[PDB]
Short mmCIF file of all heavy atoms in Angstrom, two decimals:
data_model
loop_
_atom_site.label_atom_id
_atom_site.label_comp_id
_atom_site.label_asym_id
_atom_site.label_seq_id
_atom_site.Cartn_x
_atom_site.Cartn_y
_atom_site.Cartn_z
N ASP A 1 9.47 26.21 -16.09
CA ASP A 1 10.79 26.54 -15.58
C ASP A 1 11.14 25.42 -14.62
O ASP A 1 10.32 25.06 -13.77
CB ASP A 1 10.77 27.89 -14.86
CG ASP A 1 12.16 28.48 -14.69
OD1 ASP A 1 13.07 28.08 -15.44
OD2 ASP A 1 12.33 29.34 -13.80
N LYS A 2 12.34 24.87 -14.74
CA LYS A 2 12.72 23.76 -13.87
C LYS A 2 13.36 24.11 -12.52
O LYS A 2 13.12 23.43 -11.52
CB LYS A 2 13.65 22.80 -14.62
CG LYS A 2 12.93 21.63 -15.27
CD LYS A 2 13.71 21.08 -16.46
CE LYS A 2 14.69 20.01 -16.02
NZ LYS A 2 15.61 19.62 -17.13
N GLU A 3 14.16 25.17 -12.49
CA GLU A 3 14.85 25.59 -11.28
C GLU A 3 13.88 25.94 -10.16
O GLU A 3 13.98 25.40 -9.06
CB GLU A 3 15.73 26.79 -11.61
CG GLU A 3 16.53 27.29 -10.53
CD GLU A 3 17.42 28.47 -10.94
OE1 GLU A 3 17.28 28.82 -12.13
OE2 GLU A 3 18.20 29.03 -10.13
N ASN A 4 12.95 26.86 -10.41
CA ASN A 4 12.00 27.25 -9.38
C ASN A 4 11.00 26.15 -9.13
O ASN A 4 10.54 25.98 -8.00
CB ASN A 4 11.25 28.52 -9.77
CG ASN A 4 12.13 29.72 -9.80
OD1 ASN A 4 13.06 29.84 -9.00
ND2 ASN A 4 11.85 30.63 -10.71
N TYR A 5 10.65 25.38 -10.18
CA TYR A 5 9.71 24.30 -9.98
C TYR A 5 10.28 23.22 -9.08
O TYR A 5 9.52 22.49 -8.44
CB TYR A 5 9.27 23.68 -11.31
CG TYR A 5 8.10 22.74 -11.08
CD1 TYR A 5 6.83 23.24 -10.84
CD2 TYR A 5 8.28 21.36 -11.07
CE1 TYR A 5 5.77 22.41 -10.61
CE2 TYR A 5 7.20 20.51 -10.84
CZ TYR A 5 5.95 21.05 -10.61
OH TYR A 5 4.86 20.25 -10.37
N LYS A 6 11.60 23.10 -9.03
CA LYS A 6 12.20 22.17 -8.08
C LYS A 6 11.87 22.62 -6.66
O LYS A 6 11.33 21.84 -5.86
CB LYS A 6 13.71 22.07 -8.32
CG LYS A 6 14.45 21.10 -7.39
CD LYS A 6 15.92 20.92 -7.78
CE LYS A 6 16.73 20.40 -6.62
NZ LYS A 6 16.02 19.30 -5.90
N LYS A 7 12.14 23.89 -6.35
CA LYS A 7 11.75 24.52 -5.08
C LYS A 7 10.27 24.37 -4.73
O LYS A 7 9.93 24.13 -3.56
CB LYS A 7 12.12 26.01 -5.18
CG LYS A 7 13.56 26.37 -4.72
CD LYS A 7 14.11 27.75 -5.25
CE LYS A 7 14.22 28.91 -4.27
NZ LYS A 7 13.78 30.06 -5.17
N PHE A 8 9.39 24.45 -5.71
CA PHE A 8 7.99 24.22 -5.38
C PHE A 8 7.74 22.75 -5.07
O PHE A 8 7.15 22.40 -4.04
CB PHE A 8 7.12 24.71 -6.53
CG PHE A 8 5.71 24.21 -6.48
CD1 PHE A 8 4.75 24.87 -5.71
CD2 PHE A 8 5.33 23.10 -7.21
CE1 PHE A 8 3.45 24.41 -5.68
CE2 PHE A 8 4.03 22.64 -7.17
CZ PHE A 8 3.08 23.30 -6.41
N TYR A 9 8.26 21.86 -5.92
CA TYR A 9 7.91 20.45 -5.83
C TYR A 9 8.43 19.82 -4.54
O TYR A 9 7.78 18.94 -3.97
CB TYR A 9 8.46 19.69 -7.04
CG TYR A 9 7.82 18.34 -7.18
CD1 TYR A 9 6.52 18.21 -7.63
CD2 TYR A 9 8.51 17.19 -6.81
CE1 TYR A 9 5.91 16.98 -7.74
CE2 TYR A 9 7.92 15.93 -6.93
CZ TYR A 9 6.62 15.84 -7.40
OH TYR A 9 6.01 14.61 -7.51
N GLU A 10 9.61 20.26 -4.07
CA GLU A 10 10.14 19.73 -2.82
C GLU A 10 9.23 20.03 -1.64
O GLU A 10 9.16 19.23 -0.70
CB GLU A 10 11.53 20.31 -2.53
CG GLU A 10 12.46 20.36 -3.70
CD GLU A 10 13.83 20.91 -3.34
OE1 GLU A 10 14.52 20.29 -2.49
OE2 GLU A 10 14.18 21.99 -3.87
N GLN A 11 8.52 21.16 -1.67
CA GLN A 11 7.66 21.56 -0.56
C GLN A 11 6.25 21.00 -0.68
O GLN A 11 5.64 20.66 0.34
CB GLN A 11 7.60 23.08 -0.49
CG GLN A 11 8.97 23.72 -0.38
CD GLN A 11 9.70 23.35 0.89
OE1 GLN A 11 9.09 23.22 1.95
NE2 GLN A 11 11.02 23.17 0.79
N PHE A 12 5.72 20.87 -1.90
CA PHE A 12 4.29 20.62 -2.06
C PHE A 12 3.95 19.37 -2.87
O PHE A 12 2.76 19.15 -3.18
CB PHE A 12 3.65 21.86 -2.68
CG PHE A 12 3.85 23.10 -1.86
CD1 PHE A 12 4.61 24.15 -2.34
CD2 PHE A 12 3.29 23.19 -0.60
CE1 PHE A 12 4.80 25.30 -1.56
CE2 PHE A 12 3.48 24.33 0.19
CZ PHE A 12 4.23 25.38 -0.30
N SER A 13 4.94 18.52 -3.18
CA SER A 13 4.65 17.30 -3.94
C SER A 13 3.57 16.47 -3.28
O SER A 13 2.71 15.87 -3.95
CB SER A 13 5.92 16.48 -4.14
OG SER A 13 6.44 15.95 -2.93
N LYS A 14 3.55 16.44 -1.94
CA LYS A 14 2.51 15.65 -1.29
C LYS A 14 1.14 16.27 -1.49
O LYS A 14 0.15 15.54 -1.61
CB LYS A 14 2.80 15.50 0.21
CG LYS A 14 4.26 15.19 0.55
CD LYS A 14 4.42 14.80 2.02
CE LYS A 14 5.82 14.26 2.28
NZ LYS A 14 6.84 14.95 1.44
N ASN A 15 1.09 17.60 -1.64
CA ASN A 15 -0.18 18.25 -1.95
C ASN A 15 -0.65 17.90 -3.34
O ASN A 15 -1.84 17.65 -3.55
CB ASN A 15 -0.04 19.77 -1.81
CG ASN A 15 0.37 20.18 -0.42
OD1 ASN A 15 1.53 20.08 -0.05
ND2 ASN A 15 -0.60 20.63 0.36
N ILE A 16 0.27 17.89 -4.31
CA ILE A 16 -0.11 17.46 -5.65
C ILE A 16 -0.65 16.04 -5.63
O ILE A 16 -1.68 15.73 -6.23
CB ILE A 16 1.08 17.58 -6.62
CG1 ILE A 16 1.58 19.03 -6.74
CG2 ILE A 16 0.71 16.95 -7.97
CD1 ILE A 16 0.61 19.99 -7.47
N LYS A 17 0.04 15.14 -4.92
CA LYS A 17 -0.40 13.74 -4.91
C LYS A 17 -1.73 13.57 -4.18
O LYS A 17 -2.60 12.82 -4.64
CB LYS A 17 0.69 12.85 -4.30
CG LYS A 17 1.93 12.75 -5.20
CD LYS A 17 3.11 12.09 -4.51
CE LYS A 17 4.33 12.07 -5.42
NZ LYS A 17 5.49 11.39 -4.77
N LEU A 18 -1.94 14.27 -3.06
CA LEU A 18 -3.25 14.11 -2.44
C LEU A 18 -4.33 14.72 -3.33
O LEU A 18 -5.44 14.19 -3.41
CB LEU A 18 -3.28 14.71 -1.04
CG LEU A 18 -4.68 14.61 -0.40
CD1 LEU A 18 -5.09 13.15 -0.22
CD2 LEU A 18 -4.87 15.34 0.92
N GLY A 19 -4.00 15.79 -4.07
CA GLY A 19 -4.91 16.24 -5.10
C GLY A 19 -5.22 15.14 -6.11
O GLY A 19 -6.39 14.93 -6.46
N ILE A 20 -4.19 14.41 -6.56
CA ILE A 20 -4.41 13.27 -7.45
C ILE A 20 -5.48 12.37 -6.86
O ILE A 20 -6.47 12.02 -7.51
CB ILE A 20 -3.10 12.48 -7.69
CG1 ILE A 20 -2.03 13.26 -8.48
CG2 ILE A 20 -3.38 11.16 -8.40
CD1 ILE A 20 -2.24 13.32 -9.94
N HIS A 21 -5.33 12.05 -5.56
CA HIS A 21 -6.22 11.06 -4.97
C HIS A 21 -7.64 11.56 -4.78
O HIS A 21 -8.59 10.81 -4.97
CB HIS A 21 -5.69 10.56 -3.64
CG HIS A 21 -6.52 9.46 -3.09
ND1 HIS A 21 -7.62 9.68 -2.29
CD2 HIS A 21 -6.51 8.12 -3.34
CE1 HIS A 21 -8.21 8.53 -2.01
NE2 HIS A 21 -7.55 7.57 -2.64
N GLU A 22 -7.80 12.82 -4.37
CA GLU A 22 -9.12 13.29 -3.95
C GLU A 22 -9.85 14.09 -5.02
O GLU A 22 -11.07 14.26 -4.90
CB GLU A 22 -9.01 14.13 -2.67
CG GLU A 22 -8.58 13.33 -1.44
CD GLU A 22 -9.60 12.28 -1.02
OE1 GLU A 22 -10.78 12.37 -1.42
OE2 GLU A 22 -9.21 11.33 -0.29
N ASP A 23 -9.16 14.61 -6.03
CA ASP A 23 -9.75 15.54 -6.99
C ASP A 23 -9.82 14.88 -8.36
O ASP A 23 -8.85 14.91 -9.13
CB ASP A 23 -8.96 16.84 -7.03
CG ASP A 23 -9.67 17.94 -7.78
OD1 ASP A 23 -10.66 17.66 -8.48
OD2 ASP A 23 -9.22 19.10 -7.67
N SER A 24 -10.98 14.32 -8.69
CA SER A 24 -11.11 13.57 -9.94
C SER A 24 -11.16 14.50 -11.14
O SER A 24 -10.59 14.19 -12.20
CB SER A 24 -12.36 12.69 -9.90
OG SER A 24 -12.45 12.02 -8.66
N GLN A 25 -11.84 15.65 -11.01
CA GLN A 25 -12.01 16.50 -12.18
C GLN A 25 -10.71 17.17 -12.58
O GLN A 25 -10.58 17.63 -13.72
CB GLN A 25 -13.09 17.55 -11.92
CG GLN A 25 -13.43 18.39 -13.15
CD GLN A 25 -14.61 19.31 -12.92
OE1 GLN A 25 -15.25 19.26 -11.88
NE2 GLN A 25 -14.89 20.16 -13.91
N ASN A 26 -9.73 17.22 -11.68
CA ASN A 26 -8.47 17.88 -11.96
C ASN A 26 -7.30 16.91 -11.98
O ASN A 26 -6.15 17.35 -12.05
CB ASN A 26 -8.22 18.98 -10.93
CG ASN A 26 -9.20 20.13 -11.06
OD1 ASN A 26 -9.14 20.88 -12.02
ND2 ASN A 26 -10.09 20.27 -10.08
N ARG A 27 -7.57 15.60 -11.96
CA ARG A 27 -6.48 14.65 -11.77
C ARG A 27 -5.50 14.63 -12.94
O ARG A 27 -4.30 14.46 -12.72
CB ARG A 27 -7.05 13.25 -11.52
CG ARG A 27 -5.96 12.25 -11.26
CD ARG A 27 -6.47 10.96 -10.63
NE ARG A 27 -7.91 10.82 -10.68
CZ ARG A 27 -8.69 10.73 -9.60
NH1 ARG A 27 -8.17 10.77 -8.39
NH2 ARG A 27 -10.00 10.58 -9.74
N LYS A 28 -5.97 14.85 -14.16
CA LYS A 28 -5.07 14.82 -15.32
C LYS A 28 -4.01 15.92 -15.22
O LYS A 28 -2.80 15.65 -15.32
CB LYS A 28 -5.87 14.94 -16.61
CG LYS A 28 -5.02 15.18 -17.84
CD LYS A 28 -5.86 15.33 -19.12
CE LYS A 28 -6.58 14.04 -19.52
NZ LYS A 28 -7.35 14.20 -20.81
N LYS A 29 -4.44 17.17 -15.02
CA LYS A 29 -3.46 18.25 -14.96
C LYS A 29 -2.59 18.14 -13.72
O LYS A 29 -1.42 18.57 -13.75
CB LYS A 29 -4.14 19.62 -15.01
CG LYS A 29 -3.12 20.75 -15.11
CD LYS A 29 -3.75 22.11 -15.28
CE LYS A 29 -3.36 22.71 -16.63
NZ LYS A 29 -1.93 22.46 -16.98
N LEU A 30 -3.13 17.62 -12.62
CA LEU A 30 -2.29 17.38 -11.45
C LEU A 30 -1.20 16.36 -11.77
O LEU A 30 -0.05 16.51 -11.34
CB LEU A 30 -3.14 16.92 -10.26
CG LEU A 30 -4.07 17.93 -9.58
CD1 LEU A 30 -5.03 17.20 -8.68
CD2 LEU A 30 -3.26 18.89 -8.76
N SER A 31 -1.54 15.31 -12.52
CA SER A 31 -0.54 14.32 -12.90
C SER A 31 0.53 14.95 -13.78
O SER A 31 1.68 14.51 -13.77
CB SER A 31 -1.18 13.13 -13.61
OG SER A 31 -1.53 13.49 -14.92
N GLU A 32 0.16 15.97 -14.57
CA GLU A 32 1.22 16.63 -15.33
C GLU A 32 2.23 17.34 -14.44
O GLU A 32 3.31 17.70 -14.93
CB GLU A 32 0.61 17.63 -16.32
CG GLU A 32 -0.36 16.98 -17.27
CD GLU A 32 -1.08 17.97 -18.15
OE1 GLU A 32 -0.83 19.19 -18.02
OE2 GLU A 32 -1.93 17.51 -18.94
N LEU A 33 1.92 17.53 -13.16
CA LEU A 33 2.84 18.18 -12.23
C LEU A 33 3.67 17.21 -11.41
O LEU A 33 4.58 17.65 -10.70
CB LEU A 33 2.07 19.10 -11.27
CG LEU A 33 1.30 20.25 -11.91
CD1 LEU A 33 0.29 20.83 -10.95
CD2 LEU A 33 2.29 21.30 -12.36
N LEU A 34 3.37 15.91 -11.46
CA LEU A 34 4.19 14.94 -10.76
C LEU A 34 5.60 14.90 -11.35
O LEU A 34 5.82 15.17 -12.53
CB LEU A 34 3.57 13.54 -10.84
CG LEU A 34 2.18 13.41 -10.22
CD1 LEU A 34 1.49 12.18 -10.72
CD2 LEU A 34 2.30 13.39 -8.72
N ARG A 35 6.57 14.59 -10.48
CA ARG A 35 7.98 14.43 -10.82
C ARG A 35 8.48 13.20 -10.08
O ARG A 35 8.14 13.02 -8.90
CB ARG A 35 8.82 15.64 -10.42
CG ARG A 35 8.55 16.93 -11.18
CD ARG A 35 8.58 16.72 -12.66
NE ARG A 35 8.30 17.98 -13.37
CZ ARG A 35 7.12 18.30 -13.91
NH1 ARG A 35 6.09 17.46 -13.84
NH2 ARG A 35 6.97 19.47 -14.53
N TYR A 36 9.26 12.35 -10.76
CA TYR A 36 9.79 11.13 -10.15
C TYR A 36 11.21 10.85 -10.62
O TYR A 36 11.57 11.15 -11.76
CB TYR A 36 8.97 9.91 -10.51
CG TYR A 36 7.53 9.92 -10.10
CD1 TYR A 36 6.53 10.13 -11.04
CD2 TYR A 36 7.16 9.64 -8.79
CE1 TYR A 36 5.20 10.11 -10.67
CE2 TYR A 36 5.83 9.61 -8.42
CZ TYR A 36 4.86 9.85 -9.37
OH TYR A 36 3.54 9.80 -9.02
N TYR A 37 12.01 10.24 -9.75
CA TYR A 37 13.20 9.56 -10.23
C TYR A 37 12.79 8.35 -11.05
O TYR A 37 11.78 7.70 -10.77
CB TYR A 37 14.12 9.12 -9.09
CG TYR A 37 14.62 10.26 -8.24
CD1 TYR A 37 14.04 10.52 -7.00
CD2 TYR A 37 15.69 11.06 -8.67
CE1 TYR A 37 14.50 11.56 -6.21
CE2 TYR A 37 16.15 12.10 -7.89
CZ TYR A 37 15.55 12.34 -6.65
OH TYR A 37 16.00 13.38 -5.86
N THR A 38 13.55 8.07 -12.11
CA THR A 38 13.35 6.89 -12.93
C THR A 38 14.69 6.23 -13.18
O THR A 38 15.75 6.81 -12.94
CB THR A 38 12.70 7.23 -14.28
OG1 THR A 38 13.70 7.80 -15.13
CG2 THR A 38 11.55 8.21 -14.11
N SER A 39 14.62 5.02 -13.74
CA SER A 39 15.84 4.29 -14.09
C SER A 39 16.66 5.04 -15.13
O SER A 39 17.86 4.78 -15.24
CB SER A 39 15.50 2.89 -14.59
OG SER A 39 14.66 2.92 -15.73
N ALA A 40 16.08 6.00 -15.84
CA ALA A 40 16.82 6.77 -16.82
C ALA A 40 17.15 8.19 -16.37
O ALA A 40 17.93 8.87 -17.04
CB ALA A 40 16.05 6.83 -18.14
N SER A 41 16.60 8.65 -15.25
CA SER A 41 16.67 10.08 -14.93
C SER A 41 17.87 10.46 -14.08
O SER A 41 18.11 11.65 -13.86
CB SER A 41 15.40 10.53 -14.23
OG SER A 41 15.37 10.07 -12.89
N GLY A 42 18.65 9.48 -13.61
CA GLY A 42 19.80 9.80 -12.79
C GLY A 42 19.39 10.48 -11.49
O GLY A 42 18.49 10.03 -10.78
N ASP A 43 20.06 11.59 -11.20
CA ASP A 43 19.84 12.34 -9.97
C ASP A 43 18.62 13.26 -10.05
O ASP A 43 18.34 13.96 -9.08
CB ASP A 43 21.08 13.17 -9.64
CG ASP A 43 22.24 12.32 -9.18
OD1 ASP A 43 22.01 11.14 -8.85
OD2 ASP A 43 23.37 12.84 -9.14
N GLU A 44 17.91 13.27 -11.18
CA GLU A 44 16.85 14.23 -11.43
C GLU A 44 15.46 13.60 -11.36
O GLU A 44 15.22 12.52 -11.91
CB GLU A 44 17.02 14.89 -12.80
CG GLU A 44 16.02 15.99 -13.01
CD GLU A 44 16.19 16.69 -14.33
OE1 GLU A 44 17.22 16.46 -15.01
OE2 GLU A 44 15.28 17.46 -14.69
N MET A 45 14.53 14.30 -10.70
CA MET A 45 13.12 13.95 -10.78
C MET A 45 12.52 14.56 -12.05
O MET A 45 12.63 15.77 -12.27
CB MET A 45 12.37 14.46 -9.56
CG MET A 45 12.28 13.43 -8.47
SD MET A 45 11.78 14.12 -6.89
CE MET A 45 13.24 15.09 -6.53
N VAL A 46 11.90 13.71 -12.88
CA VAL A 46 11.41 14.13 -14.18
C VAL A 46 9.91 13.82 -14.28
O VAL A 46 9.34 13.13 -13.43
CB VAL A 46 12.17 13.47 -15.34
CG1 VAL A 46 13.64 13.81 -15.25
CG2 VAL A 46 11.93 11.96 -15.33
N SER A 47 9.29 14.37 -15.33
CA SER A 47 7.85 14.35 -15.52
C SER A 47 7.41 13.10 -16.27
O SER A 47 8.19 12.44 -16.96
CB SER A 47 7.40 15.58 -16.32
OG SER A 47 7.81 15.44 -17.67
#
């Protein structure tokens, strides 16, 4: 779901990223939770 996931990501994106850095066994699924602006995404953070 994108609407509520926006609300989560705004609060805890730094937690996901520090998980990326410190948690090797879970880094793949954590990366599936990253969201970024891109040159194609306009105003939206995408996966």
Side-chain angles (χ1 to χ4, degrees):
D1 197 21
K2 266 155 89 189
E3 183 178 2
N4 292 326
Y5 190 75
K6 181 173 159 44
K7 271 161 107 219
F8 165 84
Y9 195 74
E10 316 182 61
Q11 305 296 323
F12 301 114
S13 66
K14 317 191 170 34
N15 300 78
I16 299 290
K17 291 169 183 182
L18 177 63
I20 293 281
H21 185 272
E22 293 295 341
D23 192 347
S24 315
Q25 186 173 355
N26 292 290
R27 182 164 13 242
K28 169 181 293 182
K29 187 175 244 319
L30 289 167
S31 76
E32 303 174 0
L33 298 164
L34 299 162
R35 292 309 179 259
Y36 300 105
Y37 300 101
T38 76
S39 59
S41 74
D43 289 345
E44 186 178 349
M45 267 166 292
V46 302
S47 72

